[PDB]
């Protein structure tokens, strides 16, 4: 309950760099239909927003500035909006990948033409001759890794949102 | 500097969560011959001991009766040993994945029972005309993703070990 007003800024900075690095890392070509997480280009601007929010509070510890508090609460409102948007998109993406493909979400050419003949949503043996094949096993491993990455991202986003809710007051 | 070492306890806690979560993520059966980082189970114990040290690091930040001075040397030495072991493991694994492996490091059975037929070390069919198959593209994508993960982990481990070395000095 309102422990410290400064030590959380470094945490927010590191989570912002976390989102930026994850967004940069998850740009590898995977299927014609890229995941909705990267098509929107959400992680990069989200992470830059978190890094700016952290830089605005981690190393200031000051008051008696009207502009400072105005910008702080406005950017906190945008941070809440970004957090809820990220939660919604993560839930939609995990439900789309896990359950069944229902959205196209075409992406840019430089991340789509690299792998234009592969699928990462429903890759099951159409014929029994490839029930246990390297292609389907590799796609299953890719899907499992993507599910794990999405779960980790959702957990970290939930923790960060809880931290913000505890720091909004 | 030593003046503001209190704020880094949560940083070390987050680093421990990093080690534990990434160990759990890499625990998945990505090929028969798993990277040496996950076979030795270094990330799990490294993260747990970072968690313990960070919990003790931000206990009181002062001189109690007997609460901090006893650990401030032993746990710092353990953290330094963990950091050097981790960077050694990372620089060994990057070479073992970039160059043909000379360690076996067989994966454990209870995870190998899921996907026991994935080969990354030599995924090149003898047919030169077979290079256009999607299997080769999948193997190349897996190799690129693993290279990116190893590079990011090495960079972040170097950053955390250098900041810890600077703080303890």
């Amino acid at each position: 309950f309102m422990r410290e007003s400064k030590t959380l800024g470094a945490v927010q900075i590191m989570n912002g760099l976390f989102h930026i690095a994850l967004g940069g890392l998850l740009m590898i070509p995977a299927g014609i239909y890229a995941p909705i997480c990267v098509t929107v280009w959400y992680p990069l601007w989200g992470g830059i927003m978190y890094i700016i929010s952290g830089s605005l509070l981690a190393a200031t510890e000051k008051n008696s500035r009207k502009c400072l508090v105005k910008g702080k609460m406005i950017m906190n409102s945008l941070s809440l909006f970004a957090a809820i948007s990220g939660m919604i998109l993560s839930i939609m993406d995990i439900l789309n990948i896990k359950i069944s493909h229902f959205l196209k979400m075409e992406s840019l050419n430089f991340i789509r033409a690299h792998t234009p003949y592969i699928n990462i949503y429903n890759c099951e043996p159409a014929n029994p001759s490839e029930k246990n094949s390297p292609s389907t096993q590799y796609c299953y491993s890719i899907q499992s890794l993507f599910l794990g990455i999405l779960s980790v991202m959702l957990i970290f986003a939930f923790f960060q949102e809880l931290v913000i809710a505890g720091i909004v007051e | 500097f030593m003046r503001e070492s209190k704020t880094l306890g949560a940083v070390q806690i987050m680093n421990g969560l990093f080690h534990i979560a990434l160990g759990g993520l890499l625990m998945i059966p990505a090929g028969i011959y798993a990277p040496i980082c996950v076979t030795v189970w270094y990330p799990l114990w490294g993260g747990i001991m970072y968690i313990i040290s960070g919990s003790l690091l931000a206990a009181t930040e002062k001189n109690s009766r007997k609460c901090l001075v006893k650990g401030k040397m032993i746990m710092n030495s353990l953290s330094l040993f963990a950091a050097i072991s981790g960077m050694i493991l990372s620089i060994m694994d990057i070479l073992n994945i970039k160059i043909s492996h000379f360690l076996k490091m067989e994966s454990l059975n209870f995870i190998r029972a899921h996907t026991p037929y994935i080969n990354i070390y030599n995924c090149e069919p003898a047919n030169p005309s077979e290079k256009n198959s999607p299997s080769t593209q999948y193997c190349y994508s897996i190799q690129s993703l693993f290279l990116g993960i190893l590079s990011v982990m090495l960079i972040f481990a170097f950053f955390q070990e250098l900041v810890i070395a600077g703080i303890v000095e």
Partner: antibody
Amino acid sequence: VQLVQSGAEVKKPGSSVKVSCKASGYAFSYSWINWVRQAPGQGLEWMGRIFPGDGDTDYNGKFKGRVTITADKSTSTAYMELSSLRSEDTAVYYCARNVFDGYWLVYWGQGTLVTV
Amino acid sequence: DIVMTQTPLSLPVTPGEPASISCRSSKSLLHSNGITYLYWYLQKPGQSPQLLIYQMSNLVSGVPDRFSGSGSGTDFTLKISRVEAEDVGVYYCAQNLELPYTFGGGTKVE
């Protein structure tokens, strides 16, 4: 890669016959073994398939499960085991190696004919 | 299961002009993936069987150059620009999408 199969054998109705389809020059556990029989009067007819890596097996289901197929990893050779052969079952059997990702049954075998 | 019918059954050999092998599937073979699987076999005495055409889009190396093949999804036709006496034999049409596998009756060409 080379495929060596045993010579033709002459049998009698109601007996049992075994054929050795030796495999060499490739990864025996990285290919699904397919067996196809050819009888006079009509074309080819699939009968069964086996995967020696995990022991998974498939059957045509045309008959009441009379097909019994097993594989040995130590020798990398699959064996034929059929009970109570009949006159109508007199045909030549071929063991073929499959290639994944498009080349379904490009590789064939020498084949072995059985007469009862 | 799945039964295939082909015609003509005999198709006497005549070099150059006449060359047409037709096969059809009774289950309207289509997996909605944009492609349809089809295979062709040649059985001439003297050697073991070999693959000729795979899903009617490309051919294995070493095949005679004057070979082709296409289809629509329900009726499949095989066309040869110039048939020769060297590559004489029977034609087998095959489908592999569900168990059990069934092979065509073949067209005995003499």
